[PDB]
Structure 1
Amino acid sequence: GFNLKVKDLNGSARGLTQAFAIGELKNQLSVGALQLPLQFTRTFSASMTSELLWEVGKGNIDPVMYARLFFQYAQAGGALSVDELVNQFTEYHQSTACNPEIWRKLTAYITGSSNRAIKADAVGKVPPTAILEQLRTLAPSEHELFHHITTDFVCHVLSPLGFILPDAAYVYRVGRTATYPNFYALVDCVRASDLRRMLTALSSVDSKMLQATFKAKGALAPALISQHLANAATTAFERSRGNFDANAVVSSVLTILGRLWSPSTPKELDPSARLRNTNGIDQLRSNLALFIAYQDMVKQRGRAEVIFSDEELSSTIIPWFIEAMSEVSPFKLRPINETTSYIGQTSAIDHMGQPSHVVVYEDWQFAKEITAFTPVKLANNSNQRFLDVEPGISDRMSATLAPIGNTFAVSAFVKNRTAVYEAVSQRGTVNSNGAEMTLGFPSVVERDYALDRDPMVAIAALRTGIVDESLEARASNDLKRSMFNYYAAVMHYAVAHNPEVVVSEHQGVAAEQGSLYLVWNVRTELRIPVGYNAIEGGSIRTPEPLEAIAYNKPIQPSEVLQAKVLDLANHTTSIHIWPWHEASTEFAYEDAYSVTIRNKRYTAEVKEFELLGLGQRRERVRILKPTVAHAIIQMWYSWFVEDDRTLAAARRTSRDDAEKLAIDGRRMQNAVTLLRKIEMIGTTGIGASAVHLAQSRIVDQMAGRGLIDDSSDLHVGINRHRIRIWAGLAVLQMMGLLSRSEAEALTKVLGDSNALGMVVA
């Protein structure tokens, strides 16, 4: 997790200001009043968890399926924007009519030189993909994907009444995707919708051509409708010359929505009553995270009012459509009440009783089991591979994670984190300007870390507010998405609490008063200073969502919070291949234990191995790291290094002996935290394996030199706890979770303190 001050926050982390999204640049705080009331449809969203595997290649074909696939592909960062995927796709099937030969040759597969026409059909369907790999020689395909696409028309079932088999399909694993959207994500949505406008007609045409085909004869003679097949689809491809223009339409519905927001009356911003109605927008005004997307792209690209729309006809064609009313996005529009709620609340009491520890937190049970893949490549001799799930490290390590599936529950974490509770004297005097604002989400880490980037750098970029901006455009991307997902998540969750919101320019640089933020209100909070407001008027009135967050009364989490976890043995006997890599290849790696007693080096040196007790190596497998399982413990890692370096900065600053007592107790209580945690980690059964076996090895080392064979001399007290960590080290790296540069940290922190048991055991 992670925390801020309650009074200050901009001096703690600029990223959660509305102002930073507004690009206010650290200076003046937003406050400007003169307000317009709102309401909630609790706003459009995504899913949150959707780990599943589509079938393709079975010849059913449905654009909504592929839309997810390309969308996920960009979410894999396989190229970049979906829009790029699409323009490059059209660049691909600019091999459109310039290649009649696609028909002439696939029909040649139908056998062929079909001027020798007849009810020729016999058998063969399901792998034109290879003869179409010859079509890849005809249609080179640096991407696997569209090459894997085009097969379908000839072989969805065509000719639907024979050809014939498949008895086989294909594969891909969509994972859960991004939680909340943005400019690029949206244009990717509507772009995916132009593709939606593509493929469905592309199926329907053939769907009727087949009706007009088997005139009988039987399937009738070729070099015709077959030789047709998709020429009409090419015309359908030419029906696709003009959907819209994604950035323009998105910017359009955007800024017109903003005009619907802004106080600014005049003709530049006068949403016509001629069209203030007309469906959709009437609830679409209510969406609010979508509104965050507004202020976001308003932040990046100014406003750039192309206003492709008129005032009414047609201010209709442009908002004919948008992403939620697309199914093309994994993301989906959202009903009324729950918003996206699933976080409880508690708050510190000094019997006064203003909070000093805000408690806002997670809600999430991590995977109970994970399974290794055996990369049995054989077909194609390239990317094509089979994984064949089988038990291995799997079952046993999983059962060992079950206790971790208890003792590292988030509820227990925050509950202990809440137990930090009493601090700076007593009791009853803990208050002093700011107060800690602890928080964190399952999502931001589960995704940004899934991209393999280490979220904490972005987190710190938020903490300083200002972007490091030295990153690769890829990392530039992960940073951006990190930002608006943090921010917006906090926004619309905070919104999920407080019922009412009002629009607020800002002013400052105006830059034409279109720039704007929000201010909120609640009353129940006790007459105490809190944030800039205090509470002022018996009511909040704050720009800043965190402020409304702090005042909220304690509650409970709602969502099923489960990791759901994938399975695939079915699809595995089916596979085939897909962009899978990221796992990656060789399931684990050794870590080397060491210790000294009687002033002698020993170095236990253990692998990897199954370690569990059946050799050897194994080999080969690789298991996926759960995003979640490492993400959560990384939240805590962020806490560890947080209290470490920051309160060490306190060790540097306030040299007051009482403040000395504070840094003492706090750093040494995170110390007792990881202490007792690894402590319970050592009792784990694999931990038991590491204990007995590594101890067996170094006892064998005792037998090395003949005089230090004088029985065990390690065991007294300190050594046991001292090696107890080693169990937490196997549980660390190559348990499939922690990423090293970690035990590193833990080592230094375990050096920071006396540790000991500290008692128990």
Structure 2
Amino acid sequence: MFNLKVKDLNGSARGLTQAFAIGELKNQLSVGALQLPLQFTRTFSASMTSELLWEVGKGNIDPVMYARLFFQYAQAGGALSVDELVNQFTEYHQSTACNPEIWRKLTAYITGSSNRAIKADAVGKVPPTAILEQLRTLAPSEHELFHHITTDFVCHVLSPLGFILPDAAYVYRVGRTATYPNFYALVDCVRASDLRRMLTALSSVDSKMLQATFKAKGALAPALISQHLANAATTAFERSRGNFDANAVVSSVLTILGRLWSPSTPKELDPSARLRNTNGIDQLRSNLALFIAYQDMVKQRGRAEVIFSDEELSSTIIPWFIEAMSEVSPFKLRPINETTSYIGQTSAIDHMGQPSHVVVYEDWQFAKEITAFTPVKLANNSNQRFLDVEPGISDRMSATLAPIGNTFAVSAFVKNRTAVYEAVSQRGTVNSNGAEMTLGFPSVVERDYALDRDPMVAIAALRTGIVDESLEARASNDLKRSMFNYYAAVMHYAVAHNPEVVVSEHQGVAAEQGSLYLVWNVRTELRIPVGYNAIEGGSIRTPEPLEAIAYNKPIQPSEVLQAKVLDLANHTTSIHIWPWHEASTEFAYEDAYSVTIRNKRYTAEVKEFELLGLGQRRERVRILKPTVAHAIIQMWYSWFVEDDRTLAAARRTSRDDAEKLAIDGRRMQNAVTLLRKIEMIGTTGIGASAVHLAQSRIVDQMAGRGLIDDSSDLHVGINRHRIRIWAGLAVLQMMGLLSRSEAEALTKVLGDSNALGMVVATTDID
């Protein structure tokens, strides 16, 4: 839940406004003053995937992914950039490959034989982690991630011969990918083209010949190995040498685009008639993801320069820049319509036409799986520890959570919201303000739980636009990188549904020599503007991507957004080296169901280990967090209390008979759909076993005092409908899904509406 006043966009949300992206902190942004027509038909979207555990120890090299490890190690690792990293990799690669000894000394170790041939039978086995231990001393580095890449190289040429133990295994987690390129994500993905051409040379060494000459002859010296490695590692050193600075490949090729978009480009520097006609610029001219990248470029550098020869050289840059991105990468070009598919919109209309509130939401497919691991140290004061997945705890919850899944789907939240604004609104126009725009982004709040951050700094990042410094850099680096996704994800949306876009050039405050911002042509067919613009001509031209949303008609999301859980189960043996205590929630719970029977109070305590079938309380196990599940429920809570608040706010000032009865018509109808939902959770596997026990602690507490039995014609039912409801919270409480505070207010809402009173009123006949 994030609310903004679309009339004053500057103040309410500056993160999503365009005025911020191109460097206007001050309120002013130019009108539709000067313009050039354009159509964006393509975009660069990250492939749809989220982090997965990948294991580095085994002999294979999968160049695409090791590349991905560099992204994470350097970028999110706190280091400067993957660019500086890769450079320090090829100084490292030059060190070993071009050096004749370092390939002898560690083939003396693995083969055992310094000066003489080794037979075919007498071939020992040396575990992979071994040779790594020594290579550390030979070719020392400050980045362990290099030693792993060389280690499993020699493992690859020696694997057929069998000089090494297969059994050992080891594991890391690759990171999540931003869906749209930040400026630097271009620079990175260009260097990562070098790197991928590096590794594809190492990876592809068969050494079949060395396998043939070993078999027939029966023996070979280290002089055959230690050359045949040194031939491989210097084939890779070729392929690294002589590639262009990514930093100056892109910096230019985003400028010479930026000059053929902007209408005002001085003729003194005009991209020439040849490069405008270059093969491929045509396509890159119409591409969006670059544009919002360009806007970033100038936001930071403030300027641009073309170092490369304006003609002869810059026409071999582009065909090299295209081949970098176009090739399979995290970023793959797609028709623009598709990348926004999951966003959806709905609005609350006045009688005339214009919006009162208008909601924008990300659809979701609720994640119905959950896993629970127990961490196991290798030795005292060693951080290697590797977890054991425990089934039978997890089978419970995932068969418990699967019933929850069906009933919370996001579309049913907004389908509910607009049903509120129908009832609460008066009959009269809204001139008073632009229609406020509420936007659910469960992805925002989601990222706060896995990163463990106060939801208030995340929101307040979008509002004011600046990130708080008080937090440590690991968060801000994933915060800003996030806050840029939403910005981008907005404009892909706005553009997708208003194909007419027009590129101006901002120069009012003369902040930068080159600047760009779109302005949309949307045809409103409305009388009065929301936001502020002159609404002249039967179409409005609005620089802000948000306003240009508001004038859309309802849109139904065509594609469910997909969360997917991190997978521990597959590799059990491999030792986890990534910290897993960030993604782990402790699992413990206590609660008491209190009821009053014939003027006394009977309280049944209950513990979580009982609920699960465990007989004893085991401390170690830790539930791996259900973020996306806690994301949605968090949304659905805040929109529920928000609704139920706004009504009881109108319900006081209604001053009508016909309308007032329509509010209480709504609340009651709301709260007993609330409850029939929670009662539906009570029948679940944890819900069951919570009930069966709670009644049983209450019985044996009444043993001492003989008192008369109930009718249970409806009493069994009345008591039953109550005990289930308390199961409904207990299951939500014990998993992370609902915090204890909001669980209380959610009782209080269901409490005063006397929902339960009305639920039973359908089970009697009069």
| Normalised-by-shorter TM-score class | 0.7 to 0.9
Query: 1:156 deviation in Å?
Result: 0.8
Between Structure 1 and Structure 2, the one with more helix by share is: 2
CA change 1:300–1:729 in 2 (3 A) is farther
User: Structure 1-normalised TM-score?
Assistant: 0.83
Which secondary structure does the structure 1 equivalent of 2:322 belong to?
A: coil
The root-mean-square deviation of aligned C-alpha atoms, in Å, is: 4.8
30-39 vs 139-148, which moves further = 139-148
- Post-superposition offset of 1:290: 2.6
The alpha-carbon deviation at position 175 of structure 1 amounts to 6.3
Q: 1:692-720, CA deviations, whole angstroms, 9 ceiling, x for partnerless residues?
A: 43454466666799999999999999998
The answer to whether residue 717 in structure 2 is matched with residue 709 in structure 1 is no
Distance 1:179 1:125, change over 3 A: farther
Q: What residue in structure 1 maps to residue 9 of structure 2?
A: 9
Q: Is contact 2:59–2:159 with CA below 8 Å preserved after alignment?
A: no
Distance in 2 (alpha carbons) for counterparts of 1:309 and 1:723: 78
How far apart are residue 44 of structure 1 and its match? 0.9
Greater mean deviation of Cα atoms: 652-661 or 502-511:
652-661
Q: Which residue of 2 aligns with 1:510?
A: 510
Question: Could you tell me how far 1:635 is from its partner in structure 2?
Answer: 3.0
Give the Cα–Cα distance (whole angstroms) in 2 for the partners of residues 640 and 457 of structure 1.
22
Distance 1:230 1:413, change over 3 A: farther
For the residues of structure 1 that align with 2:646 and 2:465, how far apart are their CA atoms? Answer: 17
Structure-2 change in CA distance of 1:301 and 1:652 (3 Å): farther
Larger mean CA deviation between 312-321 and 84-93 belongs to: 84-93
Listed one character per residue, the Cα deviations across residues 275-301 of structure 1 (whole Å, up to 9, x for unaligned) are 123333321222213311221232233
**Cα pair distance change 1:270/1:612, threshold 3 Å:** same
Deviations for 1:723-750, whole angstroms, at most 9, x for unmatched residues? 7665344333441434666547757877
Q: Give me the whole-angstrom Cα distance separating, in 2, the residues matched to 1:276 and 1:124.
A: 63
Greater Cα shift, 280-289 or 402-411: 280-289
CA distance in 2, matches of 1:443, 1:407: 19
SS in 2 for 1:107: helix
Q: Deviations over 1:162-210 (max 9, x none)?
A: 5477377655554653222212333332333332243223345676985
1:131-189 Cα distance to aligned partner (Å, 9 max, x none): 42343455667765333322122111337455477377655554653222212333332
Change (3 A) 1:433 1:560: closer
Q: Distance in 2 between matches of 1:705 and 1:78?
A: 67
Write the distance in 2 (CA, Å) between the matches of 1:657 and 1:99. Answer: 91
Q: Which residue of 2 aligns with 1:194?
A: 194
- Judged with a 3 Å threshold, the aligned counterparts in structure 2 of structure 1 residues 414 and 691 are, in CA distance, closer, same or farther, namely same
Paired residue for 2:363? Answer: 363
Aligned position for 1:585:
585
Alpha-carbon distance change, 536 to 117 in structure 1, aligned in 2, over 3 angstroms: same
Q: Flag the 1:598–1:305 CA change in 2: closer, same or farther, 3 A.
A: farther
Q: Distance in 1 between matches of 2:213 and 2:276?
A: 48
Q: How many pairs were matched up?
A: 760
Alignment of 1:422 with 2:422, yes or no, is: yes
- C-alpha change, 1:132 and 1:461, in structure 2 (3 Å) is closer
In 2, the alpha carbon distance for the partners of 1:144 and 1:713 equals: 71
Q: The residue matched to 1:65 in structure 2 has which SS?
A: helix
Distance 2:76 2:708 in 1: 56
Q: Secondary structure at the match of 1:338?
A: helix
- Report if the CA contact (8 A) 1:32-1:505 is conserved: no
Report if the CA contact (8 A) 1:189-1:328 is conserved: no
Distance 1:319 1:654 in 2: 67
In 2, the alpha carbon distance for the partners of 1:201 and 1:429 equals 69
Q: CA deviation at 1:616?
A: 2.6
For residues 640-655 of structure 1, the aligned pairs below 5 Å read none
Q: Comparing 27-36 with 573-582, which one deviates more in the overlay?
A: 573-582
Task: Tell me the CA shift for residue 640 of structure 1.
Answer: 5.9
**After alignment, is 598-607 or 617-626 more displaced?**
598-607
SS of the residue aligned with 1:243? coil
* Correspondence 1:738-757 to 2 at 5 A: 738=738, 742-743=742-743
Q: Is the 8 A contact 1:384 1:577 kept in 2?
A: yes
Q: Over residues 396-425 of structure 1, what are the superposed CA-to-partner deviations in whole Å (9 max), with x where a residue is unaligned?
A: 222222232122101111111221132555
Label 1:487 to 1:224 Cα distance change in 2 as closer, same or farther (>3 A): same
Query: Which residue is 2:718 aligned to?
Result: 718
Alpha-carbon spacing, 1:548–1:32, altered in 2? closer, same or farther (3 Å): closer
Q: Deviations over 1:441-488 (max 9, x none)?
A: 454444454333355522222134454444332232233112211111
3-state SS of paired residue (1:292): helix
**Higher mean Cα deviation, 621-630 or 689-698?**
689-698
Report deviation, 1:339: 3.7
Distance 1:400-1:333 versus aligned 2 partners, 3 A rule: same
- Checking the alignment, whether the CA contact within 8 Å between 1:295 and 1:515 is kept in structure 2 is yes
After superposing the two structures, state which structure 1 stretch, 236-245 or 461-470, moved more: 236-245
Mapped contact 2:609–2:615 kept (Cα < 8 A): yes
521-530 or 282-291: bigger deviation: 521-530
Secondary structure (helix, strand or coil) at the match of 1:461 reads helix
Q: Evaluate the alpha carbon distance shift between residue 75 and residue 66 of structure 1 in structure 2; reply closer, same or farther with a 3 A threshold.
A: same
State the alpha-carbon separation in 1 of the partners of residues 191 and 307 from structure 2.
Answer: 19
Asked if the contact 1:50–1:176 (Cα under 8 Å) also holds between the matched residues in 2, the reply is yes
Instruction: Give yes or no for contact 1:41–1:335 (8 Å, CA) kept in 2.
Output: yes
Once the two structures are TM-superposed, the CA of residue 537 in structure 1 deviates from its matched residue by 0.8
Find the counterpart in structure 1 of residue 697 from structure 2. 697
The CA distance in 1 between the partners of 2:324 and 2:697, in whole Å, is 61
Moved more, 719-728 or 189-198: 719-728
84-93 vs 195-204, which moves further? 84-93
**Worse-matched range after superposition: 621-630 or 401-410:** 621-630
By how many angstroms is 1:687 displaced? 3.0
Report the secondary structure of 1:86's partner residue. Answer: helix
- Once the 2 structures are TM-superposed, how far is the Cα of residue 517 of structure 1 from its aligned partner? 1.0
Change (3 A) 1:302 1:82: same
Larger deviation, residues 264-273 vs 719-728: 719-728
Q: Secondary structure at the match of 1:474?
A: helix
CA change 1:314–1:188 in 2 (3 A) is closer
Q: Aligned pair in 2 of structure 1 residues 576, 3: CA closer, same or farther (>3 Å)? A: closer
CA, structure 1 residues 74+512, in 2 after alignment: closer, same or farther (shift >3 Å)? closer
SS of 2:308's equivalent? coil
Moved more, 463-472 or 137-146: 137-146
Moved more, 253-262 or 310-319: 310-319
CA drift at 1:609: 1.0
CA contact (8 A) 1:424 1:430 kept: no
Which is further off, 521-530 or 732-741? 732-741
SS at structure 1 position matched to 2:359: coil
Q: How far is the alpha carbon of 1:503 from its aligned partner?
A: 0.8
Residue pair 1:377, 1:384 contacting (<8 A) in 2 also = yes
SS in structure 2 at match of 1:318: helix
Question: 1:345 aligns to what SS in structure 2?
Answer: strand
Give the match's secondary structure for 1:153: helix
Q: 1:472 to 1:383 in 2, by over 3 A?
A: closer
Q: Provide closer, same or farther for how the CA distance between residues 500 and 169 of structure 1 changes in structure 2, counting only shifts above 3 A.
A: farther
Asked if 1 retains the 8 angstrom alpha-carbon contact of 2:32 and 2:541, the reply is: no
CA contact (8 A) 2:388 2:572 kept: yes
SS at structure 1 position matched to 2:674: helix
Judge conservation of contact 1:625–1:737 (CA < 8 Å) in 2: no
List per-residue Cα deviations over 1:352-388 (Å, max 9, x = no partner).
3333232332222112222222434549984545544
Contact 1:422 1:430 in 2 (8 A): no
The whole-number CA distance in structure 2 between the counterparts of 1:663 and 1:32 is: 44
Residues 500 and 520, structure 1, Cα contact 8 Å, conserved in 2:
yes
Deviates most, 668-677 or 8-17? 668-677
Deviation at 1:506, TM superposition (A): 1.6
> Structure 1 464/175 Cα, relative in aligned 2: closer, same or farther at 3 Å?
closer
Instruction: Name the % identity.
Output: 100
Separation in 2 of the partners of 1:20 and 1:655?
Answer: 43
5+ residue gaps, structure 1 = none
Moved more, 80-89 or 650-659: 650-659
- Per-residue deviation, 1:76: 6.0
Using a 3 Å threshold, how does the CA distance of structure 1 residues 297 and 752 change in structure 2: closer, same or farther?
farther
Structure-2 change in CA distance of 1:436 and 1:132 (3 Å): same
